[PDB]
Amino acid sequence: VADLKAFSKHIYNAYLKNFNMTKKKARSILTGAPFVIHDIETLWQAEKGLVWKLPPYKEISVHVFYRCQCTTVETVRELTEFAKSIPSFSSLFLNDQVTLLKYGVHEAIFAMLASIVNKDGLLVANGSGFVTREFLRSLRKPFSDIIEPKFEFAVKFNALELDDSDLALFIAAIILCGDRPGLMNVPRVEAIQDTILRALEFHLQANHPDAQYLFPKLLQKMADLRQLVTEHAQMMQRIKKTETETSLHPLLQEIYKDMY
């Protein structure tokens, strides 16, 4: 319908408004330049100005973990603003908005990760840096363990060849999940999500006319993301317990507090 077309483009513009790094920009950068971070000395150089311009850390692995936290916390703030633009999200009681974000932002974050990833690494600092996967693999347990599964997910996710207009609806659908623990107005949320998902099905058909089964494949990706984040949360809670000298940003603490 033309509502669904108008709805999709509204969500897309909210996405363009709230996330500076898009898949389109990242793909232009990746295909052809970013400074390559691939060891401790190029990380130092990157911090010295080439890429970037952090609680005290004692090892490279925790230092990288802290950069991870900086970026995800920023992306949580962007997603909160984005969600305010999803029709009827702001009509929910504030505590439901908080529950939806608490349980959805990291699913959305690890979906958006694929936009800035190739099989060899990811873009950092707004395209100006590229961190190699093989360097992240060089970090110690459990930081390498919490990183690599996200690459695996992301490279498979990129096989679907989504673009930003698809992703904007996908992320909105992730945030508006009616089965989050402790929601109050489950039917409200479900209805909003159903509007988003019908818009997504339509948009995918218009945008990828020759792609068969793309919509159910994306619904499956949503479930895979839930599982990915469940296991992520498990590793973050564990790191909190075992890695006493490693800091968690208080927003991430709150998100993982009593999660799953």
Next chain:
Amino acid sequence: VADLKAFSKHIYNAYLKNFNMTKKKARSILTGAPFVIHDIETLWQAEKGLVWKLPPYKEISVHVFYRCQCTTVETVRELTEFAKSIPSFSSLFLNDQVTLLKYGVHEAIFAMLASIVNKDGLLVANGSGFVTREFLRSLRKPFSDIIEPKFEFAVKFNALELDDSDLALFIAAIILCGDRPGLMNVPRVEAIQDTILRALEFHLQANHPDAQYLFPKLLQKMADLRQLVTEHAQMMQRIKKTETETSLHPLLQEIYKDMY
């Protein structure tokens, strides 16, 4: 200072904006008319149009309890809007805004109750009804038990002879408490509260020049309110467990969920 004077008047206007029933209006109505609800048949008449124009109930006590819930849920919504007008409250992360409201709205509600109370009853439905205390006392345990302590608090509170401009700062100070369980940015909240409280001390001195110790007496009232609401929450959780056929509004369920 004149900041503190400007701050106080900003909070006052936010209060005038968000709560239709003020102490000033209620005192004009009480002093001299509202329809008097004092038994089951005058409650029926009031519902028939004289005052009002509810999940299914089987007894007068639960029916009154449901009216209680209607009003408090409305007042929670007004307080949420009010809080958005307290300087820097909206700058807090959404989850902290939710924690502050969760733990503060009923303290604020049972403070504001005194505005519409005299020793004989309270105003309902925007001054058009007056429910007698002795009728509320006629309800069965535990509804009479959850009602009477609020009257006792309120009549003592009215002995302080606060007016609406005092109350607006008092309620703001209640919402901005830095010791709520689970807050993230405790120092932020404390600082905002300290601004509110210095404004309150100033405002009280300007408004009640001959009242000695009024400010520490109000701080004590805040602690008394915390205790009142702690015990209230205990009785609501108990009613939830023992009174299986009695409904709780899902917002009240969320507020009392894991409270104290």
